[PDB]
C-alpha cells in the first residue's frame, strides 16, 4: 500500500557533431575564458 | 591432486628461525636475558618522535 | 631543498605506484589470457 | 557526529541510486508509456 | 503482624491448591 | 456448576491473553512484585546494605533519578535469611533492612518460572512443539543466577544484583574486582553468544528483507520470495541455538563464580633473569582490579 | 593464475608459523 | 490551472503511532535524567 | 506551462537533457586528474601530520 | 517536579501498553 | 499512502517546488544566523577581553563574524576592547539584520516558487516530463563557486577591497583583523600560515572557473553516464553528501 | 578489449567471487590479518608500553596483542618509509608501526568488504540491505579505532588489538570516562541485547510453528536466499504471541526489517557516544547529585559509590597503563575504602 | 538542578507526539 | 531454442509469457509465468538466473522470483527488460525459435 517516488531520467542520446551556431558559441566560450583567466593571473600578481 | 613437494622443510624453516635466534633480530624483540640493563631498573620508553630510532639504538648499546 | 622526509615520501609514492600498477598489470594479463 | 551520520546518509542514497530498478520494480531506462503484446 | 501473616498464608495456600486442583482435575469439558 | 465456568474461562485459547493454570500463579506474583517495585522505586527509606548505620538511599523521593535510582538489596545482618514483613519488629525496621528487595525478587522469580510454564502451556494447547519454553530458559537461568545462586554462594542477599540502572553497574564493577569475570571463559562465551546473536539478527534480517518481494493473507498465506543467489533447513535452529547456549554458559559462569572458582589471573606470567618481573596485559587488569577491590573495603 | 594461491598465501606462513610456535615451547 | 498533480497522501496507521509513541516516551525516560541533571 | 521571460532567457542551458559523449570520452584525463588530486591530498595530510617535513615549513603556531 | 516528570513518562508508557494490547489495529 | 519518512520525496519530479523547498531551507539557515547573532549580542559582556573573552562566554556565532572582519557593534565597543569606534554599517547588529531581511526575502521567493511551480524552464519541449540538465548544472554552479572563491580570496583576504582576516601571534596576545598577503611556495600548506588560505582561494578559484567552463562546454561520456546513473537526481545527492561529510570531518579536524 | 575483458573476468563464476571490490579487499584484508598474526607471534610491546605481548616472549592467546604506538609519536601515520622508522623494519616493529599498519588496512579492508556486498547485490539483483547493515560495524571501527585516538593525545589511547588489551580498554572507559552511565552507550547495550533476544525468539518460533512437523512432511524444494522462510506459519505464531505477550508481528517483512533495524541503530548510537568521548565530552556526573553529595556527607546512592570505584580504577591503573606520564603516586594518596 | 531542563523534557515528549497524533487523526479522515 | 534455470538442465514446462513494448519501439521486457515447473518439484540445486540458450548466443534474466503457497512453491514468475532495440529483436528471434519448437499462441492484442 505504501507509495514511493523516484526520478524520471531523460533519454540517453549521443552528442552529434556540431554546427557553426554551436561551434562559434563554443569558440566564444573558450576565447572568452582564456582571456578571463589571463586577467585573473594578473590580478593574482597585483595582490601578491 | 597430491602435493608433497615440501611440507616439513617449512617446519624446520620455522624452527631454525626461533631456535637460532633470528626472530629476535628481525622483529626487534628483546632476548629474555636482555630486557633491562646491568645496573638500572628503568623501562626504555621512547620519549621523542624524530629521535625515537636513535633512542632505541641508544638503549641497545647498554646491553 | 630535498629533505629526508620528502625523499622518503618519494620512495613511498613510487613503491605504492608500483604495487598499484603491478597488480593491475598482472590482472590485465591474466584476464587477457583466460579470455573465453 | 554530523559527519558520521552523513556517512550513513551517503550509503543509503548511493544504494538507492544505483539499485533503482530493484528498489522500485520499474527499470529507469524503459519509457513508462508502455503498452502490451501478448503471447 | 499476625493479621498480615495468616492473611498471606491463606492466599498462598488458596492459589497453590487452586493450581494443583485445576491442573489435574478438570482436563476435559 | 460454577467451577466449570471458571475451568472453561481459564483454559480457553479464545481470549485476548492466555491465563493458563500457570497464569493463576503468574498473575498475582508478577503483580505484587510490580506494585512493590513501583512503590519501592518511587518512595522507599534508605537501606544499609552493610551492618553499619550508613544507609544507601536508593529511591526517587530521596534525591535520585531514573539512572541512579535502585531498590537496594538486603542488609548484611540478614544474610540468606527469609525476611517477610511479619518477621520484622516494625514496618520501619523492615524498610530499613532491605525487605522490599527480597519480596520483589522472590515474587519475580516465581512469576517468571510460571511465565515459562505458561509459554509451554499455551504451546501444548495450540498443538505446537516445546522450544519457546526452552529458549526463554536462558534469560530465566541468567536471572536465577544473579538473584538467587550468587547470594547462596556468597552467603548474603546483599551480594545480589540491585534493581536499578546504576546498581547493575555497581554489581558488575564489584564482581569484576572480586572475581575477574572478563578472563573467565564462560563469560567470554556469553559475550560471543550475545555479539553473535546481534550479528545473526542483523544479517538474517537484511538477507530476508532484501529477498522478500510480496506476501499476502486472504484474511492460505502467500509469499513470493525472490530466490536465486550467486556462486538441510536448519538456519533458525542455529539462530536460536547460538544466543541461547551463549547466555546459558555465562549464567552458569556466574553460578560457578558464586562458589569462588573465579576467572583467570595470569599473575606474573613473564619473567626476567635478574629477578625482574615484566608486565603483560594481565597485570594491568589485575592492577585495576586492585583499584576497585580496595575501594570496596 | 588459479585458486592455487589460496595455498601459497595462506598455508605457507601457516606451516612456517606453526613451526615457529612449536619451536617456541622449548625455550628456557 | 493544474494543481501540481503530485500531492500523494500521508498514511500513519495506529501500529505506527504506537511504535513512535513508544520510541519518543522511552527516549524521554532515558534522557530526562540528563536534561534535569 | 508558463513561458516567462527568464524561462526564455535561461533555456539554452536546460536544453541538452541526456546528451552524452560517445564511448569513453575524457575518462583517462579524469583518471590522471583524480590521481593528481590523490597525491595532492596525500601531501597535504602528511604535511599536517608532520610525516613530510619541508625546508622552511614549521607546522606549529611558531 | 523532578520526580513527577519521571512518574508521568512511566505512567504514559503503561497507558500506551494498555492501548497497544487491547485497542490493537485489526488486520 | 506515503509513510512519514518519505513525504519529502514528492519534490523529486518537480524542479520548481524543489527550488521552493531549498529556498525555504536557506531562509531557515539565514534566520538562525541572524537570530543567533541577536541572542549573542544580547547576552555579551564586552567589558574585559583579557580574562573574559568570547570563548569563555559560550559565544559560538560571534567568532565566525569576528574571524572575517566584523569588529565592533553599534552600541560603541569592540572585540579588541577600545570602547569607541565607528565601524559603519557592518557591525554585529548590521549583519544580523542583514541575515534577517535575507531570510524574509528567501521566504517570499520560496512562496513564489511553490505557487508558480510549472514553468517552461523545467520541462522538455519534446516530451511532457520534467527534466534537469545536471552535467551542465554542475558547470554553471562550479563556475559561480570558483568565481566567488577567487573574488573572496583575491579581494577580501588580501585587503585590496575589504578587511583582512583574524591574524594573531603564536600565543594569542596581540591579534586583530589585518590584511594578509598570499603565500606562494611550500609554506602555504602549513595550516598555521594565513597566507596559504588566500593563496588557496586565488588558486582554487582559478581551477574552479576553468573546470566550470569545461563542463559548460563538454558533455559527459556515455560509460560513466550510465555507470554513475546521471539523469537521476539522487546520484547528485549521494556525491554531495560524500563531499559534505568529507568537509565536515576536515573542519572538525 | 581493454576494460570489458577485465570486467568479465572479475565478475566470472568461481570458488570465491573477486569483483572490482576484491582488489581493494583481499590485499588489505590479507595484510591486516597477517600483520596481526606476525605481531602477536613475534613483535614485543616493550619500547612503547613497557609490556611483553607476544608468543615469542611467552604469552598465551589471551595476553598477546599488537599494541598501540608510544605517546610521543602523536597521531603520526608511522609509515615504513616515514621520518620515524626510516626504512628500518626492526625500528618500525619496535615503535608500534604495526598497529597503524593493521588499523589502516582494517579500515580499507572494511571499505572493500562493504563494496563487495554492494557488488554481489548488484549482480544477484537484490536490494543491498546487507551493506546497509554493515554500516554499523564500520561506524563502530571508525569511532573507536580512528576517531577516539584522533580526539585524544595520540594513538596510544586506542584498543591495542588483543584480548586482554580489549579488557583493559573496557576498564579504562569505566574508570576514566564513566562510560556505563552514558545514554548512547545504554542504547548500544539495548540494541545488542534486543538483537540477541530477537534472534533467539525468532529462531525458537520458526522452529516451532513449522508447516510440516514430521507426519505428512513432504520435503519441498528449498532455495537458500529465502533463508528457509516458507517452512513456517505466520498465523500460528501471531496467535501464540498475541496471547502470551499481547503483541506480535503479522508481517514477514516488518519483522525482518526490525531485525535489521534494532542492533544497527544500537551500534550507531554507541558510535555517536564514543565520538563524543573522543573529546572527553563524557557523561560523567549528575551535577545536582554532586551538590547533594557536597551538602551532607551522609548521602550515598549507587552512583556515588560508582564514582569512588572509578577513582580507584584511575589512580591504581594509571602509573602502569600510562608510563609516559611517570606517575609517582605514594601509598598515602591512593584511594582506599578504609580511608 | 535545571529549571529549563523540564521544558526540554516536555518539548521532547510533546513535539514528536503532536506530529504523530496529527498524522494519525489526519489519515483516519481520508487516509 | 530452450529455457534453462540451472545451466545444463532444461525447463520442460512451457511458460505463460506476456510481452510488452514501448510506443517508440525502443524498450520493453517480458513477464514470464511458469505454472508448476520441474525446478519447483525437486532438484536440490541452486538457480543462478533464467538462462535462455539459443543458436545466436544466450539471454540471461536475473529477475527470477518464485511464488509459494503454504510452504509449497507453485509458480515461478520472471521478468526481463529490453531497454534497446538490438536486444528487442534478439528476444523476438529467441521467441520465434521457442514458439516454433514448443507451441505457443502469440495472440497479439
Ligand atoms: C568512514 C569512511 C571510511 C573511513 C576510512 C578512512 C581511513 C583513513 C583515515 C586516516 C586519517 C589519518 C589522519 C591523521 C591525523 O589526523 O593526524 C593529526 C594531525 C595533527 O597532529 C596532531 O597535532 C596536534 C596539534 O599540534 C600542533 O599544536 C601544538 C601545540 O603545542 C604544537 O604547536 C605542534 O607543533 C602543532 O603541530 C598535536 O601536536 C598532536 O600530538 C598531533 O598528533 O592532523 C592532520 O594531519 C589532519 C587534520 C584534518 C583531518 C581530520 C580528520 C578527522 C578527525
Ligand atoms: C542533504 C542531506 C539530505 C537530504 C536532502 C536527504 C533527503 C531525503 N532522504 Mg536522506 N539521509 C541523510 C541526508 C539527507 N537526506 C542523512 C545524513 C541520513 C542519515 C541520518 C539520511 C538517511 C535517510 C533514510 C534512512 C531515508 C532518507 C530518505 C530521504 C528522502 C525522504 C526524506 C523524508 O521525507 O523525511 C521525512 C522526515 C520527517 C518527516 C521527520 C524526520 C525527523 C528527524 C529524524 C529529527 C528532526 C531533524 C531536525 C528537524 C533537522 C535538523 C537537521 C540538521 C541538524 C542536520 C529524501 C530524498 C528516505 C527515503 O529514501 O525515501 C525513499 C529514507 O528512508 N534519508
Ligand atoms: C565504507 C566505505 C564506503 C562504501 C561501501 C561506499 C560505497 C559507495 N560509494 Mg562512497 N565514499 C566513501 C566511502 C564509501 N563509499 C568515502 C570515504 C568517500 C570520500 C568522501 C566516498 C565518496 C563517494 C563519491 C563522491 C561517490 C561514492 C559512490 C559510492 C557508491 C558506488 C561505489 C563507489 O564509488 O566507491 C568509491 C570507492 C571507494 C570508497 C574505495 C576507495 C579506495 C581508495 C581509493 C583507497 C585509497 C588508499 C589510500 C591512498 C592509502 C593511504 C592512506 C593514508 C591514511 C596514508 C557506493 C554506494 C558514488 C555513488 O554514490 O554513485 C551513485 C559516488 O558518486 N563515494
Ligand atoms: C598553492 C595553491 C594552494 C595552497 C597554498 C592551498 C592550501 C590549503 N589547501 Mg587547498 N587546493 C588547491 C590549491 C591550494 N591550497 C587547489 C588548486 C585545489 C583543487 C580545487 C585545492 C583543494 C583542497 C582540498 C580538497 C583541501 C585543501 C586544503 C588546503 C589546506 C591544507 C592545510 C590543512 O589544514 O589541511 C587539512 C585537511 C587535510 C589534511 C585533508 C585530510 C584528507 C582526509 C584524511 C581524507 C579522508 C577523509 C575521509 C572522509 C575519511 C576520514 C576518516 C576519519 C573519520 C578517521 C590549505 C589552506 C584542505 C583544507 O581545506 O583544510 C582545511 C583540504 O581538505 N585544498
Ligand atoms: C562567500 C564569500 C564571502 C563571505 C562569507 C564574506 C563575508 C563578509 N564580508 Mg567579504 N567579500 C567577498 C566574499 C565574502 N565575504 C568577495 C567575493 C568580495 C569582493 C567583492 C568581498 C569584499 C568585502 C568588502 C568590501 C566588505 C566585506 C565585508 C564582509 C563581512 C560583512 C558582510 C556580511 O556579513 O554580509 C551578509 C550578507 C547577507 C546576509 C545577505 C543579505 C542580502 C539581502 C538583500 C539583505 C540586505 C541587508 C542589509 C540591509 C544590506 C546592507 C547595506 C550595506 C551595503 C551598507 C562578512 C564577514 C565587510 C566587512 O569588512 O565588514 C566588517 C566589507 O566592508 N567583504
Ligand atoms: C592494494 C591495496 C593496498 C592499499 C590501498 C594500501 C595502502 C596503504 N599501505 Mg599497504 N601494501 C599493500 C596493500 C595496500 N596498501 C600491498 C599489496 C603491499 C606490498 C606487499 C603493501 C605494502 C605496504 C607497506 C610496507 C606499507 C604500506 C603502507 C600503506 C599506506 C601508505 C600508502 C602510501 O603512502 O603510498 C603512496 C600512495 C599511493 C601511490 C596511492 C596505505 C594505508 C604503510 C602503512 O600502512 O603505514 C602504517 C606501510 O608501512 N603498504
Ligand atoms: C518501562 C520501559 C518499557 C520499555 C518498552 C518495553 C516494551 C517493548 C515491547 C516490544 C516493542 C515492539 C516490538 C514489536 C514491534 C512490532 O512491530 O509489533 C507491532 C506492535 O507494536 C506495538 O504495539 C507498540 C507498543 C508496544 C506495547 C508493548 C506491550 C508489552 C506487553 C506487556 C505486558 C505483557 C503481558 C505489531 O506488529 C507489526 O505492526 C505493524 C508495523 O508496521 C505492521 O502491521 C506489521 O506487519 C506488524 O503487524
Ligand atoms: C524504570 C527504569 C528503571 C528504567 C527505564 C528506562 C529505560 C527502559 C531505558 C532504556 C531506553 C532504551 C531501551 C533505549 C534503546 C533504544 C534502541 C537504540 C533500541 C531499542 C531496541 C528494541 C526496540 C528492542 C525490543 C526488542 C523486542 C522486545 C522484541 C520483541 C518482539 C516480539 C514479541 C517478537 C515475537 C515474534 C517472533 C516471531 O518470530 C514471529 C514469527 C512472531 C509473529 C512474533 O510475534
Ligand atoms: C532541537 C535541537 C536541535 C535542532 C535545532 C534546530 C534545527 C533549530 C533551528 C532553528 C531555526 C531554523 C531557527 C530559525 C529562525 C528563523 C527566524 C527567526 C526567521 C525570521 C525571519 C523574519 C523575521 C523575516 C521577516 C520579514 C519578512 C517575513 C519579509 C521580509 C521583511 C521581514 C524582514 C519583515 C539539535 C538536535 C541540533 C540540537 C539540540 C536542540
Ligand atoms: C606485516 C607486514 C607484512 C605482512 C606479512 C604477512 C601478510 C604475513 C602473513 C602471515 C600469516 C598468514 C600467518 C599465518 C599464521 C597462521 C597461524 C599462526 C595459525 C595457527 C593455527 C593454530 C595454532 C591452530 C590451532 C588449533 C585450533 C584452531 C583448535 C584445535 C587445536 C589447534 C591447535 C589445531 C609485509 C612483509 C608484507 C610488509 C611489512 C609488514
Ligand atoms: C502503586 C504505586 C504508588 C506510588 C505512590 C507514589 C506515586 C506518586 C509519586 C509522585 C511524586 C510526588 O512526590 C512529591 O514530590 C515533591 C516534588 O515535586 C516533593 O517535594 C520535595 O521537593 C520539592 C521541590 O519541588 C521541595 O520543595 C520539598 O521541600 C521536598 O519535600 C514531595 O516531598 C513529594 O511528596
Ligand atoms: C580505468 C578505466 C579507463 C578506461 S579508458 C578507455 O578504455 C578503452 C578500452 O576499453 C579505450 O579504447 C579508450 O580509448 C580509453 O579512453
Ligand atoms: Cl561499592
Ligand atoms: Fe526468518
Amino acid at each position: 500500500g505504501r507509495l514511493n517516488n523516484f526520478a524520471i531520467e531523460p533519454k540517453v542520446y549521443q552528442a552529434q557533431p556540431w554546427t557553426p551556431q554551436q561551434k562559434v558559441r563554443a569558440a566564444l566560450l573558450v576565447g572568452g575564458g582564456l582571456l578571463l583567466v589571463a586577467g585573473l593571473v594578473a590580478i593574482a600578481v597585483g595582490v601578491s | 591432486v597430491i602435493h608433497s613437494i615440501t611440507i616439513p622443510a617449512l617446519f624446520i624453516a620455522g624452527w631454525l628461525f626461533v631456535s637460532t635466534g633470528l626472530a629476535y633480530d628481525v622483529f626487534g624483540t628483546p632476548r629474555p636475558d636482555s630486557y633491562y640493563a646491568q645496573e638500572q631498573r628503568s623501562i626504555p620508553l621512547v620519549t621523542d618522535r624524530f629521535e625515537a630510532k636513535q633512542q632505541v639504538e641508544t638503549f641497545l648499546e647498554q646491553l | 631543498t630535498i629533505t629526508p622526509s620528502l625523499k622518503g615520501f618519494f620512495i613511498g609514492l613510487l613503491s605504492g605506484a608500483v604495487v598499484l600498477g603491478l597488480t593491475f598489470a598482472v590482472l590485465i594479463a591474466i584476464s587477457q589470457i583466460d579470455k573465453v | 557526529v554530523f559527519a558520521l551520520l552523513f556517512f550513513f546518509g551517503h550509503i543509503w542514497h548511493g544504494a538507492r541510486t544505483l539499485f533503482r530498478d530493484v528498489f522500485s520494480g520499474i527499470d529507469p531506462e524503459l519509457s513508462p508509456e508502455q503498452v502490451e503484446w501478448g503471447f | 503482624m499476625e493479621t498480615l501473616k495468616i492473611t498471606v498464608y491463606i492466599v498462598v495456600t488458596f492459589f497453590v491448591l487452586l493450581f494443583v486442583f485445576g491442573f489435574l482435575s478438570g482436563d476435559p469439558a | 456448576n460454577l467451577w466449570e465456568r471458571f475451568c472453561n474461562w481459564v483454559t480457553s485459547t479464545d481470549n485476548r491473553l492466555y491465563v493458563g493454570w500457570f497464569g493463576v500463579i503468574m498473575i498475582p506474583t508478577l503483580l505484587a512484585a510490580t506494585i512493590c517495585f513501583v512503590i519501592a522505586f518511587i518512595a522507599a527509606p534508605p537501606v544499609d546494605i552493610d551492618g553499619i548505620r550508613e544507609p544507601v538511599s536508593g529511591s526517587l523521593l530521596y534525591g535520585n533519578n531514573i539512572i541512579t535510582g535502585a531498590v537496594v538489596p538486603s542488609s548484611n545482618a540478614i544474610g540468606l535469611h527469609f525476611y517477610p514483613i511479619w518477621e520484622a519488629a516494625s514496618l520501619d525496621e523492615w524498610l530499613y533492612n532491605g525487605g522490599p528487595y527480597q519480596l520483589i525478587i522472590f515474587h519475580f522469580l516465581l512469576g517468571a518460572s510460571c511465565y515459562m510454564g505458561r509459554q509451554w502451556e499455551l504451546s501444548y494447547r495450540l498443538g505446537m512443539r516445546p522450544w519457546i519454553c526452552v529458549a526463554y530458559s536462558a534469560p530465566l537461568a541468567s536471572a536465577f543466577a544473579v538473584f538467587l545462586i550468587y547470594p547462596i554462594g556468597q552467603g548474603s542477599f546483599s551480594d545480589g544484583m540491585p534493581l536499578g540502572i546504576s546498581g547493575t553497574f555497581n554489581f558488575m564493577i564489584v564482581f569484576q574486582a572480586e572475581h575477574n569475570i572478563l578472563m573467565h571463559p564462560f563469560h567470554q562465551l556469553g559475550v560471543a553468544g550475545v555479539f553473535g546473536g546481534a550479528l545473526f539478527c542483523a544479517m538474517h534480517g537484511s538477507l530476508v528483507t532484501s529477498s522478500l518481494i510480496r506476501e499476502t493473507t486472504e484474511t492460505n498465506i502467500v509469499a513470493a520470495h525472490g530466490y536465486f543467489g550467486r556462486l538441510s533447513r536448519s538456519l533458525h535452529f542455529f539462530l536460536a541455538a547460538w544466543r541461547v547456549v551463549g547466555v546459558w554458559f555465562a549464567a552458569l559462569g556466574i553460578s560457578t563464580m558464586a562458589f569462588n572458582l573465579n576467572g583467570f589471573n595470569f599473575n606474573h606470567s613473564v619473567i626476567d633473569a635478574k629477578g625482574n618481573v615484566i608486565n603483560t596485559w594481565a597485570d594491568i587488569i589485575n592492577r585495576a582490579n586492585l583499584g576497585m577491590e580496595v575501594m570496596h573495603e | 593464475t588459479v585458486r592455487w594461491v589460496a595455498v601459497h598465501t595462506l598455508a605457507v606462513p601457516t606451516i612456517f608459523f606453526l613451526g615457529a610456535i612449536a619451536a617456541m615451547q622449548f625455550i628456557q | 490551472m493544474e494543481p501540481n498533480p503530485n500531492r500523494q497522501p500521508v498514511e500513519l496507521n495506529r501500529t505506527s503511532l504506537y511504535l513512535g509513541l513508544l520510541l519518543i516516551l522511552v527516549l524521554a525516560l532515558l534522557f530526562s535524567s540528563y536534561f534535569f541533571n | 506551462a508558463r513561458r516567462t521571460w527568464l524561462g526564455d532567457i535561461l533555456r539554452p542551458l536546460n536544453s541538452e537533457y541526456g546528451k552524452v559523449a560517445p564511448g569513453w570520452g575524457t575518462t583517462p584525463l579524469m583518471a590522471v586528474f583524480m590521481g593528481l588530486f590523490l597525491v595532492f591530498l596525500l601531501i597535504i595530510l602528511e604535511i599536517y601530520n608532520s610525516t613530510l617535513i619541508l625546508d622552511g615549513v614549521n607546522v606549529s603556531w611558531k | 517536579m523532578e520526580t513527577i516528570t519521571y512518574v508521568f513518562i512511566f505512567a504514559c508508557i503503561i497507558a500506551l501498553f494498555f492501548f497497544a494490547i487491547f485497542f490493537r489495529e485489526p488486520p | 499512502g506515503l509513510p512519514w519518512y518519505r513525504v519529502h520525496t514528492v519534490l523529486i519530479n518537480d524542479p520548481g517546488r524543489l527550488i521552493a523547498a531549498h529556498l525555504m531551507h536557506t531562509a531557515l539557515v539565514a534566520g538562525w544566523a541572524g537570530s543567533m547573532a541577536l541572542y549573542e549580542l544580547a547576552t555579551f559582556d564586552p567589558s574585559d577581553p583579557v580574562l573574559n573573552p568570547m570563548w569563555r562566554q559560550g559565544m559560538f556565532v560571534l567568532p565566525f563574524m569576528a574571524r572575517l572582519g566584523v569588529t565592533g557593534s553599534w552600541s560603541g565597543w569592540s572585540i579588541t576592547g577600545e570602547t569607541g569606534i565607528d565601524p559603519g554599517f557592518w557591525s554585529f547588529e548590521g549583519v544580523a539584520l542583514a541575515h534577517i531581511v535575507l531570510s524574509g526575502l528567501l521566504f517570499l521567493a520560496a512562496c513564489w516558487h511553490w505557487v508558480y511551480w510549472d514553468l517552461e524552464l523545467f520541462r522538455d519541449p519534446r516530451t511532457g516530463e520534467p527534466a534537469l540538465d545536471l552535467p551542465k548544472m554542475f558547470g554553471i554552479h562550479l563556475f559561480l563557486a570558483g568565481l566567488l572563491c577567487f573574488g573572496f580570496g583575491a579581494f577580501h583576504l588580501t585587503g585590496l577591497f575589504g578587511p583582512g582576516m583574524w591574524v594573531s601571534d603564536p600565543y594569542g596576545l596581540t591579534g586583530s583583523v589585518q590584511p594578509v598577503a598570499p603565500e606562494w611556495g611550500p609554506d602555504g600548506f602549513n595550516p598555521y600560515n594565513p597566507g596559504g588560505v588566500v593563496a588557496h582561494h586565488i588558486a582554487a578559484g582559478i581551477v574552479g572557473i576553468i573546470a566550470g567552463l569545461f563542463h559548460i562546454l563538454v558533455r559527459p561520456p556515455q560509460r560513466l553516464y550510465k555507470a554513475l546513473r546521471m539523469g537521476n537526481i539522487e546520484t547528485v545527492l549521494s556525491s554531495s553528501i560524500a563531499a559534505v561529510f568529507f568537509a565536515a570531518f576536515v573542519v572538525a579536524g | 578489449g581493454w576494460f570489458d575483458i577485465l570486467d568479465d573476468w572479475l565478475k566470472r563464476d568461481r570458488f570465491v567471487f573477486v569483483g572490482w571490490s576484491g582488489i581493494l579487499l583481499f590485499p588489505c584484508a590479507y595484510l591486516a590479518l597477517g600483520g596481526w598474526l606476525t605481531g602477536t607471534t613475534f613483535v614485543t610491546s616493550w619500547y612503547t608500553h613497557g609490556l611483553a605481548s607476544s608468543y615469542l616472549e611467552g604469552c598465551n592467546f589471551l595476553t598477546v596483542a599488537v599494541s598501540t604506538p608510544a605517546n610521543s609519536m602523536g597521531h603520526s601515520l608511522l609509515l615504513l618509509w616515514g621520518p620515524e622508522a626510516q626504512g628500518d623494519f626492526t625500528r618500525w616493529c619496535q615503535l608500534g608501526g604495526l598497529w597503524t599498519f593493521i588499523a589502516l588496512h582494517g579500515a580499507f579492508g572494511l571499505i572493500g568488504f562493504m563494496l563487495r556486498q554492494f557488488e554481489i547485490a548488484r549482480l544477484v539483483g537484490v536490494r543491498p540491505y546487507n551493506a546497509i547493515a554493515f554500516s554499523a560495524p564500520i561506524a563502530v571501527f571508525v569511532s573507536v579505532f580512528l576517531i577516539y585516538p584522533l580526539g585524544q593525545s595520540s594513538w596510544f589511547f586506542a584498543p591495542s588489538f588483543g584480548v586482554a588489551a580489549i579488557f583493559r580498554f573496557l576498564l579504562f572507559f569505566q574508570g576514566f570516562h564513566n562510560w556505563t552511565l552514558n545514554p548512547f552507550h545504554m542504547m548500544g547495550v539495548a540494541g545488542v541485547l534486543g538483537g540477541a533476544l530477537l534472534c533467539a525468539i525468532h529462531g525458537a518460533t520458526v522452529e516451532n510453528t513449522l508447516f510440516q512437523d514430521g507426519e505428512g512432511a513432504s520435503t519441498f524444494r528449498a532455495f537458500n536466499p529465502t533463508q528457509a522462510e516458507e517452512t513456517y506459519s505466520m498465523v500460528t505464531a501471531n496467535r501464540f504471541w498475541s496471547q502470551i505477550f499481547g503483541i506480535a508481528f503479522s508481517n514477514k517483512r516488518w519483522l525482518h526489517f526490525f531485525m535489521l533495524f534494532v542492533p544497527v541503530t544500537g551500534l550507531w548510537m554507541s558510535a555517536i557516544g564514543v565520538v563524543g568521548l573522543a573529546l572527553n565530552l563524557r557523561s560523567y556526573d549528575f551535577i545536582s547529585q554532586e551538590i547533594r553529595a557536597a551538602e551532607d556527607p551522609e548521602f550515598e546512592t549507587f552512583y556515588t559509590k560508582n564514582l569512588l570505584l572509578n577513582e580507584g580504577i584511575r589512580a591504581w591503573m594509571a602509573p602502569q597503563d600510562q608510563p609516559h606520564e611517570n606517575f609517582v603516586f605514594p601509598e598515602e594518596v591512593l584511594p582506599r575504602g578504609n580511608a | 538542578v535545571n529549571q529549563l531542563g523540564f521544558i526540554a523534557t516536555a518539548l521532547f515528549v510533546l513535539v514528536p507526539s503532536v506530529f504523530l497524533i496529527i498524522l494519525y487523526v489526519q489519515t483516519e479522515s481520508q487516509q | 531454442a530452450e529455457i534453462q534455470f540451472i545451466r545444463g538442465i532444461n525447463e520442460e514446462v512451457v511458460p505463460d509469457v506476456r510481452l510488452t513494448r514501448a510506443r517508440d519501439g525502443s524498450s520493453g521486457q517480458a513477464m514470464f509465468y511458469f505454472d508448476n515447473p520441474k525446478i519447483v518439484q525437486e532438484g536440490n540445486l541452486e538457480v543462478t538466473g533464467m538462462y535462455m540458450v539459443d543458436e545466436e548466443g544466450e539471454i540471461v534474466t536475473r529477475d527470477v522470483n518464485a511464488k509459494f503457497i503454504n510452504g509449497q512453491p507453485v509458480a515461478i514468475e520472471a521478468t526481463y527488460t529490453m531497454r534497446s532495440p538490438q536486444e528487442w529483436d534478439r528476444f523476438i528471434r529467441f521467441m520465434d525459435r521457442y514458439a516454433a519448437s514448443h507451441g505457443l499462441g502469440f495472440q497479439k492484442s
Side-chain angles (χ1 to χ4, degrees), chain F residues 13 16 18 57 68 118 129 131-132 166 170 206 209-212 215 225 228 233 236 279 281 287 294, chain L residues 52 124 127 130 167-168 180 208 225 227-229 239 242-244 246 252-253 289 300 306 316 337:
Chain F
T13 85
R16 185 58 204 86
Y18 180 69
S57 92
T68 79
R118 196 181 70 110
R129 306 166 49 179
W131 280 117
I132 280 111
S166 239
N170 188 66
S206 81
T209 333
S210 99
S211 129
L212 178 49
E215 91 152 8
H225 291 264
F228 107 81
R233 230 350 69 190
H236 307 268
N279 313 293
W281 273 120
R287 217 334 150 105
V294 159
Chain L
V124 202
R127 284 162 284 182
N130 214 25
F167 298 147
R168 172 253 142 206
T180 59
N208 246 28
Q227 295 274 277
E229 295 216 52
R239 186 138 157 85
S242 288
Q243 275 150 0
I244 291 300
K252 257 171 228 214
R253 260 205 74 94
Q289 281 250 17
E300 194 179 62
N306 280 343
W316 288 68

Side-chain angles (χ1 to χ4, degrees), chain F residues 69-217 220-242 244-266:
Chain F
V71 188
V72 182
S74 294
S75 64
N76 240 19
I78 282 159
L80 276 177
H81 272 322
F82 196 51
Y83 207 54
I85 324 185
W86 53 86
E87 192 83 42
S90 44
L91 188 61
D92 284 7
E93 201 200 80
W94 185 69
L95 290 178
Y96 179 63
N97 269 306
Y101 175 78
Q102 281 210 203
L103 197 128
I104 288 158
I105 69 140
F106 287 157
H107 307 164
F108 167 72
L109 288 178
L110 232 163
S113 301
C114 306
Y115 190 88
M116 177 152 151
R118 196 181 70 110
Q119 264 178 348
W120 172 87
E121 175 133 312
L122 202 240
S123 64
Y124 169 79
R125 292 241 200 300
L126 280 178
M128 292 157 51
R129 306 166 49 179
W131 280 117
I132 280 111
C133 162
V134 157
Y136 175 61
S137 78
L140 180 61
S142 286
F144 261 103
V146 175
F147 291 136
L148 235 226
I149 304 302
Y150 185 76
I152 281 161
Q154 297 300 121
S156 192
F157 275 124
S158 64
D159 286 24
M161 202 185 64
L163 312 168
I165 287 158
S166 239
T168 40
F169 310 141
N170 188 66
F171 180 80
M172 287 189 311
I173 284 161
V174 153
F175 210 120
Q176 154 74 14
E178 277 175 85
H179 291 86
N180 208 50
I181 175 151
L182 288 162
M183 301 271 259
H184 190 74
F186 274 160
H187 153 261
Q188 301 169 352
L189 295 174
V191 184
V194 156
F195 273 0
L199 198 155
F200 297 151
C201 167
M203 221 211 309
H204 174 262
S206 81
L207 279 183
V208 167
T209 333
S210 99
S211 129
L212 178 49
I213 296 175
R214 249 120 262 241
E215 91 152 8
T216 65
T217 306
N220 235 249
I221 45 182
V222 190
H225 291 264
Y227 76 111
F228 107 81
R230 54 115 228 311
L231 281 275
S232 81
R233 230 350 69 190
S234 44
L235 188 272
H236 307 268
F237 184 70
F238 175 65
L239 224 65
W242 179 282
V244 169
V245 319
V247 161
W248 270 346
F249 262 13
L252 58 104
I254 65 170
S255 279
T256 59
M257 294 300 293
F259 312 104
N260 282 102
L261 181 198
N262 40 24
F264 265 155
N265 59 320
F266 288 86

